[PDB]
């Protein structure tokens, strides 16, 4: 599980 | 930014 | 959140 | 597990 928030 | 990985 | 009951 | 990046 990868998450990202830019 | 935040990044996260399991 | 990246996770929870794995 | 319970957990990850919270």
Same mark, same amino acid.
């Given at each position: 599980? #990868? *998450? *990202? #928030? #830019?």
């Amino acid at each position: 599980m #990868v *998450g *990202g #928030v #830019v």
